[PDB]
A paper describes a structure:
JMJD5 is a JmjC domain-containing protein, present in both the nucleus and the cytoplasm. Building from an extensive peptide-based screen for potential JMJD5 substrates, our results provide evidence that JMJD5 is a JmjC-hydroxylase, catalysing the stereoselective C-3 hydroxylation of arginyl residues in sequences from proteins involved in chromatin stability (RCCD1) and translation (RPS6). Consistent with previous reports, JMJD5 residues 174–416 fold into mixed helical and β-strand topology comprising seven α-helices, 13 β-strands and 3 310 helices. Like most 2OG-oxygenases, the JMJD5 active site contains a metal centre, which is octahedrally coordinated by an HXD..H motif (H321 and D323/βII, H400/βVII), the 2OG oxalyl group and a water molecule, which is likely replaced by a dioxygen during catalysis.
Except in the apo-JMJD5 structure, the βIV–βV loop, which is involved in substrate binding in other JmjC-hydroxylases including FIH37 and ycfDs30, adopts a partial helical conformation in all JMJD5 structures. However, in the apo-JMJD5 structure, part of the βIV–βV loop (aa 351–361) adopts a hairpin conformation. In the succinate complex, part of the β3–β4 loop (aa 241–248) is disordered, whereas in the apo-JMJD5 structure the β3–β4 loop, together with βIV–βV loop, encloses the active site entirely. Compared to Complex 1, single sidechain conformations for the target arginine residues corresponding to 'productive' (A in Complex 1) and 'non-productive' (B in Complex 1) orientations were observed in Complexes 3/4 and 2/5, respectively. Comparisons of the substrate complexes with those containing 2OG and of apo-JMJD5 imply 'induced fit' on substrate binding involving substantial conformational changes in two loops and multiple active site residues.
Residue numbers in the entry: 182 to 416
Write the structure that this text describes.
Amino acid sequence: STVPRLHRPSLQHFREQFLVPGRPVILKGVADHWPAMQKWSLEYIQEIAGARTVPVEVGSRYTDEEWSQTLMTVNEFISKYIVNEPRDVGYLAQHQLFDQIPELKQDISIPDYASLGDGEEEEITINAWFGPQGTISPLHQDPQQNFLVQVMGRKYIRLYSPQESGALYPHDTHLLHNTSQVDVENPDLEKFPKFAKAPFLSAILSPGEILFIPVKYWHYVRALDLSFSVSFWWS
């Protein structure tokens, strides 16, 4: 089934109907006027920080377990993995562009819906990153509440509740813990028969929209276009 969409709901409505019971929802009209929506482009990023060095994870396939960390400039990442056709797959490690490019911080705002949490102020972790069309983030479980905001490009997202964990064949990976062994969009049901019967929610997230991913929900993502995302994590 699909993720419900709400237009600028009251803080109390979001808290009681979605945050407390742990139900996913897409909030509209909340981030659509961030300056980032009208400013961020590859050109803008390169004008500010193209010469700055960022950590990049490189691997053979988005769904493989072989990943090594490297260091390259923003310009080099864009040239090798976005402008030209790469020989492998790469993504920005840790998704923390705000460390190397603090100038971007002024172009966003923390959604007020995140201060409904028991941890506020410096306890909100904020990540920003961009990546080429086709970037896949394998199905994995999140230890904190999450807002995912699309600035550029569309993303396909699939969500499973923690109640379905057993059907997702979890294991720990060198990169992160609580990852599914299943290829969400082309599952091998001979090896993973329970996956077929797990219900899920899915949506295509577009620029300006915020997806609320409740704590311990499982989520899978694929970038359908060149993508720029911002995520907020809190307890």
